[PDB]
Design a binder for this molecule. Sequence first.
Ligand SMILES: Cn1cc(-c2ccccc2)nc1CCc1ccc2ccccc2n1
Ligand SMILES: [Mg+2]
Ligand SMILES: [Zn+2]
Length: 313
Amino acid sequence: GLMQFTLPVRLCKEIELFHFDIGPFENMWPGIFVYMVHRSCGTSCFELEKLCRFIMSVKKNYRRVPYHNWKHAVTVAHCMYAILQNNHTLFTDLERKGLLIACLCHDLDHRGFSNSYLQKFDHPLAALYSTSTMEQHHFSQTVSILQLEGHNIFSTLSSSEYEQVLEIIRKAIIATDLALYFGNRKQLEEMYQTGSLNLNNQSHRDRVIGLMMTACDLCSVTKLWPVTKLTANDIYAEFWAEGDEMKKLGIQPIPMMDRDKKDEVPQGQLGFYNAVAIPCYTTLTQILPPTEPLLKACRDNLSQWEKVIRGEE
Ligand SMILES: Cn1cc(-c2ccccc2)nc1CCc1ccc2ccccc2n1
Ligand SMILES: [Mg+2]
Ligand SMILES: [Zn+2]
């Protein structure tokens, strides 16, 4: 009850900032998550014994893949923490509880392959989940872990509150399918620009939570340049492996996944910032003004990729 998690002074201060990097000490990550849950939600939100046991089962069910790994799960949870903490009064008790767990669980048992590759391979999961294949799987794994003995962190919620929190987590995880982001943001764009956006409209909250999930998921682009640049290596390590597997199926991959076209990376990064990242943090900054530092950091990183193409680095 009176057992608080306390970080060293540099982490205690920097963790409140959007561009915080969780560091290379894997054994500190669970404690960092618990710290964030306690400040974001409260020390009474979860039983510490169950929470700690949930965290370690989630960790065990992330694989040793270059990018879509346990570090990614905690990083995305930390972007969510920073959004919630800078928007104190905009979110319910259930939403703060669910969204931190949603972020931690959002890539559970990821294999380092896209929905497209599961489809072309004809993987069993592609016949079970025709669309947002991996994202339905991540949610399926989340329910299964919550259903392990002494793992039900939501046990002190009522039946209605429990169903509500699992519906928040389900929508939040499905929303991390980037295929769904483009239409979600367009609708948010129209709703903001015609002034019809209403945060007491459940269907509108869902969309806004959705864009928050995309923003947290892409948050590598919002770090200081050295972190962004080194994370890109891990991102392309998965893509190129997938491109290798494409070539094994007798399918030339897209250039993004073809290691033979490494040189085009800087230009591919420009497109993704202009097509995906900047639009995402822009719409998010309009709806939630205090998330402006993500847009700013993302613009700074866009400029760094522009400097790479100009051979300045
Ligand atoms: C779209 N596109 C195409 C290329 C590309 C094309 C040809 C040759 C090399 C590359 N690269 C990308 C972006 C890759 C990418 C995808 C998701 C990300 C999420 C967070 C941070 C960085 C990310 N970067
Ligand atoms: Mg994912
Ligand atoms: Zn992710």
